[PDB]
Amino acid sequence: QIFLKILPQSGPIGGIKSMGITTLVQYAVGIMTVTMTFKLGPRKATGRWN
């Protein structure tokens, strides 16, 4: 399993008038590329007429 989340970022804290603990509004995007290999077996030989 591949777990993804966005690392939270803290809001400003300091001389501003009672900001309080907040979190920066951040969302993540990306391109997830998956490559699967499949072993493949040859078709069985056939001797039918039809």
Partner 1 sequence: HYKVFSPAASKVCTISPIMGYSTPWRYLDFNALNLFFSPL
Which residues sit at the interface with partner 1, rule CB under 8 A?
46-50
Shortest distance (Å) from residue 40 CB to partner 1:
22
Please answer whether residues 41 and 35 qualify as being in contact, where contact means their C-beta atoms are separated by less than 8 angstroms: no
Residues 6+ apart with CB under 8 A from 4: 28
Please answer whether residues 24 and 10 qualify as being in contact, where contact means their C-beta atoms are separated by less than 8 angstroms: yes
| Residue 38 or 49 having the CB closest to partner 1 | 49
| Residue 26 or 46 having the CB closest to partner 1 | 46
Shortest distance (Å) from residue 42 CB to partner 1:
16
